[PDB]
Design an enzyme around this catalytic site. Structure first.
Site, mmCIF file in Angstrom:
data_model
loop_
_atom_site.group_PDB
_atom_site.id
_atom_site.type_symbol
_atom_site.label_atom_id
_atom_site.label_comp_id
_atom_site.label_asym_id
_atom_site.label_seq_id
_atom_site.Cartn_x
_atom_site.Cartn_y
_atom_site.Cartn_z
ATOM 1 N N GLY A 225 0.801 8.921 1.255
ATOM 2 C CA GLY A 225 1.666 10.019 1.653
ATOM 3 C C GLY A 225 2.071 10.922 0.504
ATOM 4 N N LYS B 197 0.839 -1.190 0.000
ATOM 5 C CA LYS B 197 0.000 0.000 0.000
ATOM 6 C C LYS B 197 0.878 1.244 0.000
ATOM 7 C CE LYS B 197 -2.390 3.511 1.988
ATOM 8 N NZ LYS B 197 -1.911 4.640 2.845
ATOM 9 N N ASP C 41 -5.897 2.794 3.668
ATOM 10 C CA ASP C 41 -5.423 1.778 4.600
ATOM 11 C C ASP C 41 -6.513 0.738 4.810
ATOM 12 O OD1 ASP C 41 -2.860 2.847 5.120
ATOM 13 O OD2 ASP C 41 -3.672 4.222 6.620
ATOM 14 N N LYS D 160 -4.859 4.097 10.505
ATOM 15 C CA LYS D 160 -3.829 3.221 9.966
ATOM 16 C C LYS D 160 -3.526 2.037 10.877
ATOM 17 C CE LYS D 160 -0.411 5.296 8.019
ATOM 18 N NZ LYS D 160 -0.949 5.053 6.655
ATOM 19 N N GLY E 258 -4.186 11.188 -0.779
ATOM 20 C CA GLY E 258 -4.785 12.335 -0.123
ATOM 21 C C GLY E 258 -4.104 13.627 -0.532
#
Ligand SMILES: Nc1ncnc2c1ncn2[C@@H]1O[C@H](COP(=O)(O)OP(=O)(O)O)[C@@H](O)[C@H]1O
Ligand SMILES: Nc1ncnc2c1ncn2[C@@H]1O[C@H](COP(=O)(O)OP(=O)(O)O)[C@@H](O)[C@H]1O
Ligand SMILES: CC(=O)N[C@@H](CCC(=O)O)C(=O)O
Ligand SMILES: CC(=O)N[C@@H](CCC(=O)O)C(=O)O
Ligand code: ALF
Ligand code: ALF
Ligand SMILES: [Mg+2]
Ligand SMILES: [Mg+2]
Lengths: 258, 258
Positions: free
Chosen positions: A11, A8, A162, A217, A45
């Site tokens: 960030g 995954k 997540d 997370k 994001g």
């Protein structure tokens, strides 16, 4: 075929050419030296936040999740399911990797429903069907999956990456690695926490050490660990030299135990 | 398996819930009453134009193609490969159709290169590999393909959807239907032209009757017709009552002959 490994990505990584290059270099090396099929799940994001400011729209997160109004789901879907996903597909192509982009609804891989009316179009992800992805893996493709999903009624849903990754891990019975901007979960002094249990996570949350997206997370990782009966790692994608050992199972961040 | 049928969707359709509902109703009816596998290719210039104004960015089209600067390819990719594609996937889901979203680079379905430095990130589409899509069709999925592609060097490219549809038709040896906001190619008096040949198209272009995106559309259709040795239709998605007969081969717009 072996149990796949889901990597995954999230960030600010998605906004660094150098970081992306070092990552894909490591991915190719791993793929060419391991039989375990790989699957990528990604968030983005940052791509969303950037597009939002470009539209002068506020970003509110409730309990670590992005409030997603009906008037913003299409734009968010574009940034995540479109820009973020295709950017990764482009890097895969650049490295001669035969990848296939998907979103949670493809092959009903991950089932999604509306989590909370107060969050708007935010989805609650749960295990779906592994048939499509298993067929793609067997045919030698690298599935790259975004965290946008769709309800059975046809409503697009924004799912935290997540949680999306954990639901897909359960679906495929896959090992899971959550890569972020930091080297695992940090303590009150900003230092890496090597191992994590549900008890410790509760403690750190009660003490305010783990907050915002990290609560989501760690909860997702713990969920995956207990569902699979396998440890799940939360690590960084920042340090090139650590990438090879990381993908080979070496604990480089926080290892979630059961 | 039979030769697939590619239904290309474009125009303001993508922004009409009623039109989308009538279309998918017709798609389900066709799918449940025909063995010929379906494939959808889509554009979405309207979704892009709307997003551009939201960013106050100009839209310039050169020779029917959208100039796509490097500073706009990611946003365009988001609107087309993300929003437009996933919106269609959502309608498919709403109608219990197992669809799979793809872009031109998935399975190297359609090969793309930079068409003209003056156009920026606009791609020239050419036949690719039918392996991935053929496998999806054989497994019973409905591929929904956007017109964003990627070069072997990893550069995202914006491809006109009509040209993308024609290149995919050649790749799959598929029949092709191009659906638009108008009932085929119109003459100088705005009336539908029933049949079209290369000679007639040249004439109408010389006379200024066929202009802008329609020159690109008719050229793409003629290319498909000569490549497949099969007629290609350009028709409207606006009239619900005409959709069933249209999908069944009845000429409802302009039929391109060789
Ligand atoms: N105790 C904590 N340890 C580590 N990161 C934390 C902690 N508390 C909050 N964070 C925040 O969580 C972030 C990572 O989660 P998140 O923002 O959801 O991004 P992503 O999942 O896309 O990597 C870190 O960048 C950090 O700012
Ligand atoms: N002779 C013509 N006949 C029909 N449509 C034409 C003609 N000349 C120009 N057009 C324009 O071409 C448009 C359709 O092509 P285009 O704008 O590329 O959209 P799309 O391919 O997404 O349906 C029509 O909406 C019309 O405005
Ligand atoms: C609901 C929700 O929080 N979604 C995430 C999805 C992307 C990611 O995890 O980076 C979001 O920021 O919009
Ligand atoms: C290059 C180019 O013109 N692209 C098209 C793709 C979408 C479509 O055909 O609607 C465009 O408007 O941006
Ligand atoms: F990229 Al993220 F939550 F910001 F997965
Ligand atoms: F939707 Al279009 F060109 F505008 F295919
Ligand atoms: Mg997160
Ligand atoms: Mg067009």
């Amino acid at each position: 075929m072996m149990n796949p490994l889901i990597i995954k990505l999230g960030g600010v990584l998605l906004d660094s050419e150098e970081a992306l290059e070092r990552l894909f270099s490591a991915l190719v090396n791993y793929r060419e030296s391991h039989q375990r099929p790989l699957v990528i799940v990604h968030g983005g994001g940052c791509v969303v936040d950037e597009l939002m400011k470009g539209l002068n729209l506020p970003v509110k997160k409730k309990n670590g999740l992005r409030v997603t109004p009906a008037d913003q789901i299409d734009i968010i879907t574009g940034a995540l399911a479109g820009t973020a996903n295709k950017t990764l597909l482009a890097w895969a192509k650049k490295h001669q990797i035969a990848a296939v982009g998907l979103f949670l609804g493809d092959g009903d891989s991950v089932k999604v429903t509306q989590l909370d009316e107060e969050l708007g179009h935010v989805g609650l992800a749960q295990p779906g069907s592994p048939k499509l992805i298993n067929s793609l893996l067997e045919n030698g493709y690298l599935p790259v999956v975004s965290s946008i999903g769709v309800t059975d009624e046809g409503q697009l849903m924004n799912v935290n990456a997540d949680q999306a990754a954990t639901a897909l891990a359960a679906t495929l019975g896959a090992d899971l690695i959550l890569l972020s901007d930091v080297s695992g979960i940090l303590d009150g002094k900003g230092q890496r926490i090597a191992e994590m249990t549900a008890a410790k996570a509760e403690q750190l949350i009660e003490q305010g050490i783990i907050t915002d997206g990290m609560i989501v997370k760690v909860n997702a990782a713990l969920d995956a660990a207990r569902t699979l009966g396998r440890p799940v790692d939360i690590a960084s994608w920042r340090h090139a030299e650590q990438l090879p050992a990381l993908f080979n199972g070496m604990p480089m961040g926080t290892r979630i135990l059961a």
